Each structure stands twice: as C-alpha cells, then as structure tokens.
C-alpha cells in the first residue's frame, strides 16, 4: 500500500539501548571435600571453580557450534555502557559499609567468612576491602569479586563502552555543515548541558556492499523507500492562480469555436491544485532518491510537449529512462520543430538506438535553436564527492541552479522559430501555445528556482551516498501535470519547514546506523563461523536475519540466491575492533573452559596394561591423564563424519594401545569392586556393532576409601591398577586473596537520545529567499 | 568411493557355491545395422534409468523465485508475444524431469 | 537482466555440475552391457522449460543413489545380460545342429 512502506520507515528506531546489571558471570566458586594422598577426608573442606551451567553436549562439532551461540549472546547483550553506582550492594563486614559489585561478590564473602577457612588473612582482607571516590575526576573505585575470567570480561567493557561528552558546540556541529551555513535559515536554542553529558554516537560508515552491482531488487526496495520518505518532505505549494481563472483566459488567447480545433486537447491539464503539487514533489524525490520515471503523453497534446522542453532543459535526461526520452524527443522533433519551421521535407525517419535529440543538433542551423541542443543533449549531473563528509551528492550543473539563463534562452529560441512554415493553419494552434510559455516565462524563471533550491537543500541530509543507476519500477509521470505546474505558477515562494528537514536527517541516519551496524554484526559472525570449521551450519542463515532487521524487504519473497551473494560480500568485511577484540578473548581460553566443568571430558585412552592413577586432592585418586603422552589418536569428530573405515573396528578387535578425542560423556563409579573387575574394558565392545559412537559412556573411578563403602581394600595397602584413564584437566583451586581484582569506572552519568531537539528553528520571510547566488529567489511580480 | 560404507557380517562355510554370471561382451554388433532394435534397447535402458535417478530435494519455492523474476524480467514492456517465458512453471516437477 | 540471474546463481550452478558429474560417474560403474554411441532412430523431448528451472532453482540440496538402489540396478543389467548371452548360446547350438 501507499503509506504502508512509510510506517515501516518512520517506525525504525535503531537507536536501541542496552543497560547492564549483573556483572557477566561464567563460574561460581564452590565446596567439595578434600582428599589428602592416602584418600581420607581431612575435614575443613576446600573451595574450587566449576562452571555455572555445564550445558556442554556430545561431539566436537556440536561443541564448536555451542560457543558460537555464546558469541551471538555476547553481542546482543554487549554493554552499550555501564555504571557502577547502579550495581551497588553493601559488605556485611569491613572498616564499614564498603558497598561491593554484584550480589555474588557479597554472598561469597559472608560464606567463606563462616565455614572455617584459612583463617586470619582471609577474614582480615575481607575486612579492609572497600570503596573510595576521587570526585575530582569523576572516577570511581569499587571492589568486586568475580573470577579471573570474569574480571576479564567486565574489564574490557570499562575500556570500550561508548559515551562521550556533550557541549553546546557539539550539538551545533551535528547540524549539517551546509545548513547552518545556508543563509535563508536561522537557529536558536534552550539549554546548557552540564559536564555530565554523554551523547552516544550514531555511527554511519558507508554501504561496504555496493548493493547496486548485482542486487537490483533490494536496491529497488530501498529506492522506493527513500523515495516515499522524500515526498513526505517536499513542501506543499502555496497560492497559485485559481484553477478556473487561468484555464479560462487560456481558451481565449487561442480563439476557439464550434468548427473543431486542436488546442482543445491541452486542457486535461487543468487539475493542478493536485497536479502541480504532485509534479513538484515527484520531481524532487526522483532526483534525491534518484529514481527513474516514465512518461504518459498524447501525440495530439502539443502544449503538454512544450512544457516537456521545460523539463528536459532541467533534469539531465539520463534521469529519465531510455525508451522515454526516445519517444519524447522524436515526438518533438517530428511534430513541433520541423513541421512548422519549413524544415519538414523528410518528416524525420528514426529506427531505434543512437540518440534522437542529438542528431537533430548537427542537422539544422539556427543559433538560438542550436544552443538548446548542446546544452540539453550533453547536460548531465556533476558527480561531486565530499560535502562536509562523504555525501557523494549527484548535483545539478551550477548553471541551471537559478542562473537560469537557460530558461531565458529556452524562450528566446522559441521566440524565433515561430517565423517560417508549411501547412497553413497548424501553425496557428502551435505557435499560440508557444506564446503561453513566453508570457509566463517571467514566472517559469521561478519554477526553476524553486526546485533548484529545494533539491539543492533537502540534499545535504542524505548520508546515504546516492548514485546514478536505473530503477526498475519506474515511477509514472504525466506531461499533464507537468504542463500544469508550468503555466500555472508564480509570485509564490515556498521552503522546507525546519522540523521537516531534521526529521529527514534523523531517518537516513538511523537507517544508515542500522545498515552499518548489522553489517558488523553480520561479518563478525561469519568470520567466527569459519575459524570453527562448522561445515554444517549452512549459511542461508545469517543473510536471512540480516536483511530482515532492516524491514521493508519481504524476506520469504527473495530467492535464496541474492542472499548468498550477500554473504559473499559480507565475508570480506572487517569486524569492528569491538567485535573482533572479544572473539580473540573467547577462543584464547576456550580450552580452559571445556576441560574444566563436568558432564564432559575430552577423550579416553585404552592401554591394555595395568597402571597407576594420579592422587589429586579434589577427587580421591583416579583415572586421569592430562597429557596422553604417546599412543596414537583418531579424531572422533572426523570419524562420525568420515564414516569409520573399520580402522577403529580393527584396532578394537585386535587390541592395540589407542586414544580417542573430542566431546565426551563421563560416568562416575564408586564400589572399588567395579575396578578390580575391570568393568572399564567393557563399554568399548559396543562400537563394533554400531559404526557410530555416542553410546560411548567412558568410566571414571572416584576412589576415596572414605566415601566408598568398599575401603576394605584401601586397608591392606594398595595402589590403583587400571586399564584406561581419561583426558580431562583439573578444576583449578581457589585463591581468594589473588582471585579478587579492582575496578574503575565513572559516576552520575547523563545519557541522552536524539539530540537536535535542543534547537528552535525559524525562517526568514518567504518573499526574500536566497540560492547559491545571493539573489532573491522569486522576484517576478 | 569414500561416501559409501562397506562391511561384512556373515561367514562362509567351505560349502559355499554359486554359478558364474557369464557376461561376455556384445558378441553381436547390432551397433552397425539393427537400428530398429537399438532404438528399442535405448528406450528400455532409458526407462530403467529414470527408475533409478534419485528424486531431488530442497528447492526454492516456485512462487518466490518467479516473483523476484518479474521484478528483474520486466515482462510486459511493449513486446508482443507475452506469457510464453512463464509456461516455465511446474518446475517443482520440470527440474526433476529435466534432471532424470 | 536474465543473464545475471544465471551469474549470481552461478555460485550454485557450480553445484549442478558436481552433482551430475558424480551421479553419472557413479551409476555408470554398474553397467555390464558395453555402450557404443549411436544415432538412435528415436528422440526424446526436453523442454528448455524444465532445464531453465533446474538451473536458477537448485539450492544447497544434495542427493545420491541409495545403496540398495545401486545394487538393484546392477542385478538387473546382470540378469538381462546373462539371458542375452545364454539364449545366444541356446540359439547357436541349435542352428549349427540344424545344419549337420
């Protein structure tokens, strides 16, 4: 619908905030009995680190993917900024209040501070562990208990969040560097933001995607959009010769009757109190958006043509489609200029392609006529770059812009062909229409000015570097309206309401921000997606979401194709330091995470030879190797992928020392018995039957004759004989003193949204406006 | 051909016995004169083939594509002989047929 | 504009090539009957309609001959062959006898 794609635009609020609270936690410290060599529980108990949520699954592949989601969570949830007074609690102990960072920090203290810990040093520290403010710099000093991996996060968040200052000067500066400058307008404001401002920075880097080289269907959707947006702006015209009056003198000048006559078809041009407003708006947006329109004329309505010449002298033909300029010109060339200029001898024969205005140039002689031709024909856009930053504006040849010696010339050339002829009457109707442009030429001089300005104004506020291609929905324009606008105008002076202008900036802005942003969001993922070998997360995935997030595009209604190509370009895009700087962090430790935490393992060894077990403190002494030094290997991930070549099948059958690798389900047992019985050798058999494995639950033997009702054996004197241990590092222990870190941030912030608003914009009186020539735009009574 | 897994499961007594398949070649060169019959073989061998050729899967919704197609195609633009490039449809089939 | 739809999709069109490449190159394996190229007397209509579809209309699909499928194929040609060859012998034998 028409205004159903506009509510999808003005409703785009990308200036989305993200406030943080709870700190960013992965592992909470926890209890667990202590098992001194020998295997007895010496009491007191100790504190270690285990992950909050062992989520983790089965299969190296599934693992890799899992983390990936973490990346997506990190980003959505990535602090747009922070603030420490907001996350404050109090410390049960200390020289006083102390106020700490995050409930968990608190808990822990009170906790350790009761369960007979390492005594003094701990309680002590916990005491004198407080806050302190250095007001003079707005700096803040809080504590906070976390975990090496936690300080890790939250830290970078202090150093990378995004809220700069905000002085009058900056507000003034965000206002396009060509508007504050434009004379005809004035600005004036209502407040002075204090030193505590923070203003967020809508970032607007370019469309690093050249959508315009393979994706005409998305561009088309954009153009359309950008176009409707424009119309929503284009000022509504003011006071213009009451419809009736003009059209009436119109019939007069010409001399009508009851014997039939030709001028008569130049009046389905009346309606303009609709047509002129439409023709006007339509024209601008076209340019701005840079849309390509068509042409609905009639070969009997010559007037409608004359006005065409108005148009063409303007909009550098390239702006109109091909098959349209073609018709138009030849229609002029063959029914208006040759046919009443005693130049028709051949009636002009053209058979498609080459250029028809053009060729009329190098054919007939006459200066006035002759200048029109070159100026129109070779008239184009001035491909201009910078405009107070990479605006990349397609501009209109200085000349035309009010230095309309074009219009004056367009008229002088018309004043001089109305001399020779051939078919006696025909000239009557044709030249009479021509005169109606001339008298009005005092006013026509104006229309030019109008657009000149408007386009040239609105312009600036389009961060969306527009280019010059060919649309494919071709907006439709009738010479009907054109013609109306033409003769029916003058005296009036209209201009872009302040409020209006901003609104425009604002939109493109957001939009941009979204495009650029998603781009980053997109890229970041894809790249991650690679250094992860996810040969199975078929990307038809990311592209989809991407596009969606910039509503307007009917996703389902766009072939998988374009989509991929969209990835192909995204891939080559740099993450945004922010983005990147985090992934490096996740990977770098990745290993450490996995290894720790239960439910999972890493891999298992099968040495068909009795052997010892480590005597770690946490677990009693069991089946674990943190090295797998020697033996062979076989990636499981590649196994269940490849399809197993009985390589494993054979080794298992034949009994040969070997190892396995990847995500794995551990299984704890007790009753020593199990071990002597050597249960652990069983499990394996399976595989033989089912080429694939996951039904593989290896074994671990938590042995502490204390909790294992079958200590009967720890008795005699022993030393743990096993066949096959497990790959899995050991959950580090907990050193409070060091475990804690210190934090810095800032206090009492003041975040703002939007900006601009802080200004009251006024306008000079219409009657004396000015263009890029310091001349009164509209000086013909 | 990696993609394909091989394995043995049953054993074989020294009692095992089969009968040679006997696959001598052509012996009869019908390739240089009995056209009438080749045509009949080809045909046959052909149908046989279709019976095998796996059916395809996961295609792009017929509607979706043809629609972005009209946007791109600029169908009805003067040219007299319209709606002859879109009898393309029934593709969810046509492709399967064209493929086999 | 139409041409472009081949190009973009080209990233995928690739996939098509691979597909056939394999399939034919696979299936074939199990054919005993030799096969000299001959100008059959009969044709087979192939509407560029379908063709065109397959083309821009295939996604990240991936299909191949079911094991069981393949065998079944071998098996047939086999028998057939066996019959041809066999009857041949049965035939000859008689005829020659028929003469002395």
Automatic annotation (TrEMBL), chain A:
<comment type="subunit">
    <text>Homodecamer; each decamer is made up of two conformers of VP2, called VP2A and VP2B. Interacts with a VP1-VP3 complex. Interacts with the intermediate capsid protein VP6. Interacts with NSP5. Interacts (via N-terminus) with NSP2.</text>
</comment>
<dbReference type="GO" id="GO:0003723">
    <property type="term" value="F:RNA binding"/>
</dbReference>
<comment type="similarity">
    <text>Belongs to the rotavirus VP2 family.</text>
</comment>
<comment type="function">
    <text>Inner capsid protein that self-assembles to form an icosahedral capsid with a T=2 symmetry, which consists of 120 copies of VP2, with channels at each of its five-fold vertices. This capsid constitutes the innermost concentric layer of the viral mature particle. It encapsidates the polymerase VP1, the capping enzyme VP3 and the genomic dsRNA, thereby defining the core.</text>
</comment>
<dbReference type="Pfam" id="PF05087">
    <property type="entry name" value="Rota_VP2"/>
</dbReference>
<protein>
    <recommendedName>
        <fullName>Inner capsid protein VP2</fullName>
    </recommendedName>
</protein>
<feature type="region of interest" description="Hydrophobic">
    <location>
        <begin position="295"/>
        <end position="315"/>
    </location>
</feature>
<feature type="site" description="Interaction with the intermediate capsid protein VP6">
    <location>
        <position position="129"/>
    </location>
</feature>
<keyword id="KW-0677">Repeat</keyword>
<feature type="site" description="Interaction with the intermediate capsid protein VP6">
    <location>
        <position position="125"/>
    </location>
</feature>
<keyword id="KW-0694">RNA-binding</keyword>
<keyword id="KW-1153">Inner capsid protein</keyword>
<dbReference type="GO" id="GO:0019013">
    <property type="term" value="C:viral nucleocapsid"/>
</dbReference>
<dbReference type="GO" id="GO:0039625">
    <property type="term" value="C:viral inner capsid"/>
</dbReference>
<feature type="site" description="Interaction with the intermediate capsid protein VP6">
    <location>
        <position position="742"/>
    </location>
</feature>
<keyword id="KW-0832">Ubl conjugation</keyword>
<keyword id="KW-1141">T=2 icosahedral capsid protein</keyword>
<feature type="region of interest" description="Hydrophobic">
    <location>
        <begin position="323"/>
        <end position="343"/>
    </location>
</feature>
<dbReference type="InterPro" id="IPR007779">
    <property type="entry name" value="Rotavirus_VP2"/>
</dbReference>
<dbReference type="GO" id="GO:0039616">
    <property type="term" value="C:T=2 icosahedral viral capsid"/>
</dbReference>
<keyword id="KW-0946">Virion</keyword>
<keyword id="KW-0167">Capsid protein</keyword>
Automatic annotation (TrEMBL), chain B:
<comment type="function">
    <text>Inner capsid protein that self-assembles to form an icosahedral capsid with a T=2 symmetry, which consists of 120 copies of VP2, with channels at each of its five-fold vertices. This capsid constitutes the innermost concentric layer of the viral mature particle. It encapsidates the polymerase VP1, the capping enzyme VP3 and the genomic dsRNA, thereby defining the core.</text>
</comment>
<comment type="subunit">
    <text>Homodecamer; each decamer is made up of two conformers of VP2, called VP2A and VP2B. Interacts with a VP1-VP3 complex. Interacts with the intermediate capsid protein VP6. Interacts with NSP5. Interacts (via N-terminus) with NSP2.</text>
</comment>
<comment type="similarity">
    <text>Belongs to the rotavirus VP2 family.</text>
</comment>
<protein>
    <recommendedName>
        <fullName>Inner capsid protein VP2</fullName>
    </recommendedName>
</protein>
């Amino acid at each position: 619908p028409k205004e159903s794609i506009l509510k999808k635009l003005e409703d785009i609020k990308p200036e989305q905030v993200k406030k943080q609270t709870k700190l960013f936690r992965i592992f909470e410290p926890r209890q667990l009995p202590v098992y001194r060599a020998n295997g007895e529980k010496e009491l007191r108990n100790r504190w270690y680190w285990k992950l909050k949520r062992d989520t983790l699954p089965d299969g190296d592949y599934d693992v890799r993917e899992y983390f990936l989601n973490l990346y997506d969570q990190v980003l959505t949830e990535m602090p747009d900024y922070l603030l420490l007074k907001d996350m404050a609690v109090e410390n049960k102990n200390s020289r006083d209040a102390g106020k700490v960072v995050d409930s968990e920090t608190a808990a822990i203290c009170d906790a350790i501070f009761q369960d007979e810990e390492t005594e003094g040093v701990v309680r002590r520290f916990i005491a004198e562990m407080r806050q302190r403010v250095q007001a003079d710099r707005n700096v803040v000093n809080y504590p906070s208990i976390l975990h090496p991996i936690d300080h890790a996060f939250n830290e970078y968040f202090l150093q990378h969040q995004l809220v700069e200052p905000l002085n009058n000067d900056i507000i003034f500066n965000y206002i396009p560097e060509r508007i504050r400058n434009d004379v005809n307008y004035i600005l004036n404001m209502d407040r002075n933001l204090p030193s505590t401002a923070r203003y967020i920075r809508p970032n607007l880097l370019q469309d690093r995607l050249n959508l315009h080289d393979n994706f005409e269907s998305l561009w088309d959707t954009i153009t359309t959009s950008n176009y409707i947006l424009a119309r929503s702006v284009v000022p509504d015209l003011k006071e213009l010769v009451s419809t009736e009056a003009q059209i009436q003198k119109m019939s007069q000048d010409l001399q009508l009757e009851a014997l039939t006559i030709q001028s008569e078809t130049q009046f389905l041009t009346g309606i303009n109190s609709q047509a002129a407003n439409d023709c006007f708006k339509t024209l601008i947006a076209a340019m701005l958006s840079q849309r390509t329109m068509s042409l609905d004329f009639v070969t009997t309505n010559y007037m409608s043509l004359i006005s065409g010449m108005w148009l063409l002298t303007v909009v550098p033909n390239d702006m109109f489609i091909r098959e349209s300029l073609v018709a138009c010109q030849l229609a002029i060339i063959n029914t208006i200029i040759y046919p009443a200029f005693g130049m028709q001898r051949m009636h002009y024969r053209n058979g498609d392609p080459q250029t028809p205005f053009q060729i009329a140039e190098q054919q007939i002689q006459n200066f006035q006529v002759a200048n029109w031709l070159h100026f129109v024909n070779n008239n184009q856009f001035r491909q201009v770059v910078i405009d107070g930053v990479l605006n990349q504006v397609l501009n209109d040849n200085i000349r035309n812009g009010h230095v309309v010696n074009q219009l004056m010339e367009a008229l002088m050339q018309l004043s001089r062909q109305q001399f020779p002829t051939m078919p006696v009457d025909y000239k009557r109707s044709i030249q009479r229409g021509i005169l109606l442009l001339s008298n009005r030429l005092g006013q026509l001089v104006d229309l030019t000015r109008l657009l000149a300005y408007n386009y040239e104004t609105l312009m600036a506020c389009i961060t969306m570097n527009m280019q010059h291609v060919q649309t494919l929905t071709t907006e439709k324009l009738q010479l009907t309206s054109v013609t109306s606008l033409c003769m029916l105008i003058g005296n009036a002076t209209v201009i872009p309401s302040p409020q209006t202008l901003f609104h425009y900036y604002n939109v493109n802005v957001n939009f941009h921000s979204n495009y650029n942003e998603r781009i980053n969001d997109a890229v970041a993922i894809i790249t991650a997606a690679n250094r992860l070998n996810l040969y199975q997360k078929k990307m038809k995935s990311i592209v989809e979401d991407f596009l969606k997030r910039l509503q307007i595009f009917d996703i389902s209604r766009v072939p998988d194709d374009q989509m991929y190509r969209l990835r192909d370009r995204l891939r080559l895009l740099p993450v945004e330091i922010r983005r990147l700087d985090i992934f490096n962090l996740i990977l770098m430790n990745m290993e450490q995470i996995e290894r720790a935490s239960d439910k999972i393992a890493q891999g298992v060894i099968i040495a068909y030879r009795d052997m010892q077990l480590e005597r770690d403190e946490m677990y009693g002494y069991v089946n674990i190797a943190r090295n797998l030094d020697g033996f062979q290997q076989i990636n499981l991930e590649e196994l269940m992928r490849t399809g197993d070549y009985a390589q494993i099948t054979n080794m298992l059958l034949n009994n040969q020392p070997v190892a396995l690798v990847g995500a794995l389900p551990f299984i704890t047992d007790s009753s020593v018995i199990s071990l002597v019985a050597k249960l652990d050798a069983t499990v394996f058999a399976q595989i033989v039957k089912l080429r694939k494995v996951d039904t593989l639950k290896p074994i671990l033997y938590k042995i502490n004759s204390d909790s294992n009702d079958f200590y009967l054996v720890a008795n005699y004197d022993w030393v743990p004989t096993s066949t096959t241990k497990v790959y899995k590092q050991i959950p580090q222990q907990f050193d409070f003193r060091a475990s804690m870190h210190m934090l810095t941030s800032n206090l009492t912030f003041t975040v703002y949204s939007d900006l601009l608003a802080f200004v009251s914009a006024d306008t000079v009186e219409p009657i004396n406006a000015v263009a890029f020539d310091n001349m009164r735009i509209m000086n013909e009574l």
